[PDB]
Amino acid sequence: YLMEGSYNKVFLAKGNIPAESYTFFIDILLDTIRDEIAGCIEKAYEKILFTEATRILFFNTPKKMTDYAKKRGWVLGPNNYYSFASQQQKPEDTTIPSTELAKQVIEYARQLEMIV
Amino acid sequence: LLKLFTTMELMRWSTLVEDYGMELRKGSLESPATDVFGSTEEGEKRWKDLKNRVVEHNIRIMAKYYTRITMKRMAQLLDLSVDESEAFLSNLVVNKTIFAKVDRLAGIINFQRPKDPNNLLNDWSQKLNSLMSLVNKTTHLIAKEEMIHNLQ
């Protein structure tokens, strides 16, 4: 279940193993899932309602869910705000020529004998 | 009036043609050398022949001046209604003296030509040629700088 990213499947309290020391483990396990869900929600959604976000995190109280959001450092409202967008073929690449020139020197040097 | 063709805005054009209503009906002479006409064509007819020719010529100039022009402005400059202008432009493209693209669903006329990457390459190579040309100027500049500094 952990592999899949099926958060729901994970949440359980029955078995032989939940009796003994799995209690100690549950917290550690949740933190990892919540980090993974925050990173998804920023990419997926550039806006969402506050209440939806409170359900999703699967914490009961709104308050702990408010605590985490300030911690991350987000502006909040009755909506949650997020913004992202990237650029390329202007910041350097192997297909922006300066970096290529250095790369081509090695290719041509191999070719003729050098060897580099 | 010939110089007018280089600058042409075409409000001044109508004024001149109207003002000169005794030159431009005139095939006749006030002292004949060996030229003659008598106004056969009608001298009146000639103004029509000029009228298309200056409007087209104006569009030639706009092509150099502008890369994009709007149809309402282009019509204001011509002093022709928007429908009328479109009609002359269509004829003119078939004639093969300009390149222009007509967008009649927004009202914009491009005189642009589609790029090829090689085209951008050409320009890029020139910038570098200008640079070399400078080094020469600088060399000449040093030669000068010495004469002034000491004759000697």
Binding site: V105, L112, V116 | E9, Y65, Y66, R68, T70
Partner: protein, 94 residues
């Protein structure tokens, strides 16, 4: 005060400075451009003039001071490219 990073400037700023209206500047740039005081093109899709420089600007003195530092940066950049070439083999076209 740096290199050119554009030379597109719109009518609105110029018309304000010039104290002639938006309509007038179009006709005016067209008069200017005939002479070749203006080297540029006219973009009628945002009503901006792309200029191309050619101005004398006689006596710079301050710009010159800056010019000396910028040129200096340029000498270093080519120098780096050179080092790499030196290290590997010998350019023989054949």
């Amino acid at each position: 005060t740096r290199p050119a990073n554009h030379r597109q400037l719109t009518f609105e700023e110029i018309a304000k400075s010039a104290k002639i209206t938006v309509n007038e500047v179009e006709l005016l740039v067209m008069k200017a451009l005939s002479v070749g005081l203006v080297k540029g093109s006219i973009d009628e899709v945002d009503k901006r003039v792309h200029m191309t420089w050619v101005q004398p600007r006689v006596l710079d003195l301050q710009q010159i001071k800056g010019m000396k530092d910028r040129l200096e940066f340029w000498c270093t950049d080519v120098k780096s490219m050179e080092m790499l070439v030196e290290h590997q083999a010998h350019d023989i076209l054949t």
